[PDB]
Amino acid sequence: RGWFDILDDWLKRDRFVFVGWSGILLFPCAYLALGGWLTGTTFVTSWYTHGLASSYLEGCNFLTVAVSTPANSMGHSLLLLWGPEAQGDFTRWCQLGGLWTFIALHGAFGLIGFMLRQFEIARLVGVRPYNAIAFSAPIAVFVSVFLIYPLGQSSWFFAPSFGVAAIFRFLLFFQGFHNWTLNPFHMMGVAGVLGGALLCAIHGATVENTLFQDGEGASTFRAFNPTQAEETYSMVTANRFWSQIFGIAFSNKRWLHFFMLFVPVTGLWMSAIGVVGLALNLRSYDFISQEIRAAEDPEFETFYTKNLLLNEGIRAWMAPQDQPHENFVFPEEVLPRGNAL
Amino acid sequence: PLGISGTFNFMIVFQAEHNILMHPFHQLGVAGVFGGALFCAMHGSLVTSSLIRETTETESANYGYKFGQEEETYNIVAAHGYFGRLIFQYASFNNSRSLHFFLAAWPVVGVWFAALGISTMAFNLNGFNFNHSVIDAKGNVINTWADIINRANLGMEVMHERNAHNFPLDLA
Amino acid sequence: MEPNPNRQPVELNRTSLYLGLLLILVLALLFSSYFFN
Amino acid sequence: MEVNQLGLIATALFVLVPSVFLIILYVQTESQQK
């Protein structure tokens, strides 16, 4: 019972907001990431990095504000406030995109903090740490997309910027340049997210529709007691219903809930692997056989070749404003366009 | 189209012609499926984390549940203690019925709005258009991320169905 | 030789067989296009 | 079409090896004393 143990005592007091040892990492970093995002989207420009307005102060709305990435010329600079670029000047630092690295890094450490929180509370309460384990998928997504992906590319500039419309742009850029929808790792991601949503929906609805009458109310929520020992719905009825409707059904509850962990977590991990590939332009961009056939045969057309034409449009029409450091000047005559449009 | 790449074709042309990404019903749809995925993993992990010990370490914990047993297979008070401490107490569900109702309602309602988003862009009520919305003192256009989106959409528009249009407006 | 006390039987029930085959077959259905390229 | 010639054996082994793994485990499970 020395100072370390007294401190441990205090950190782990059962209060409205639990602190813990992990709280020392988590709360300042989460607070600075959130605060940085709000500061930037409220007051800070992207004129000098992107040639964009991005704050409420400039006239942007909730959908169009962002904390934007730094200029491509900054490369992968940590862009520390006391670093060689800003040199301690807060204003310049904002103008150079310092808030972007500020938010990404404090955010990363805050996520570490939060997952440590999950381990700590699980250990304290006496449960298995499957919540933290599940949270590894958010970590993988954030690290692959905001750290690994730009680190593979020329600079932080091509990371996602922190804003609604900015993220939409990130999506469209990935379609046009990476053909990301074609990527089997993204497809597995989609299957995991849509399948997760499906399981959420179907499990919630099934439980709610195989409830035992445990009260007299027509509103049935009150007919539950957290301390009760009995299942509140019928697994046997649920099992017969889905067996006769869909052909197969869960019969094991433990398996059911593990599966609910497994599907979306695995989905997100796969999507992460794909983005790690896109960091190096290691894309699933083309099917070589498709291209050999289409090059030789001007009547051969599939939805795959149709979509590449769309991609080529996206690249040529978005690049000069989206990539201002490149100083693209694409004369009218070279812009790809179909008839009339 | 009834196919994988055809589905992507549909999505890209949809973005060109409706700016679906900037449509709040599609955004509610994304909250619906991202949220559904989130709560799927969350629920799964909480229940799995509070499974009552019924097995040895050399066997699957799944064998600790038997089909049609009347007893609940996990300790919901323990799971609630955990999650309630993870955030704060009153952010967590102590009522299983309430919780499972949430689990059903969030993705279902979100996806209802996704469907309605497609179904109303069906009559060309489109996503928010903030093209050239910010203007400086002289009148120069100051681009926002919305305008960059607009450039991408333009690439899609001008390239799609490249031999099908004879007149300057794509009106359906 | 004296028998090793650390041996354990292994199991795969039928449902796990079906799930596993589904995963393998669907992964193959997904990845095969890319293997043919 | 000019597909990759290794695609066939790749797909075939991708399916067969783990499938066979599972079938082996399943069958030796069934044969264990009930």
Binding site: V236, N239, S243, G247, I248, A249, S251 | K66, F67, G68, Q69 | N13, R14, T15, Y18, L21, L22, L25, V26, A28, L29, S32, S33, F36 | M1, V3, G7, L8, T11, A12, V15
Partner: peptide
């Protein structure tokens, strides 16, 4: 060969549906 492969994997999956449903291990109440 490609087409044969695609259709073959699909066919195996459909057969798998059949066995998973009609030849599942029956759920038994305890």
């Amino acid at each position: 060969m490609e087409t044969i492969t695609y259709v073959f994997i699909f066919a195996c999956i459909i057969a798998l549906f059949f066995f998973a449903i009609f030849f599942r291990e029956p759920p038994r109440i305890t």
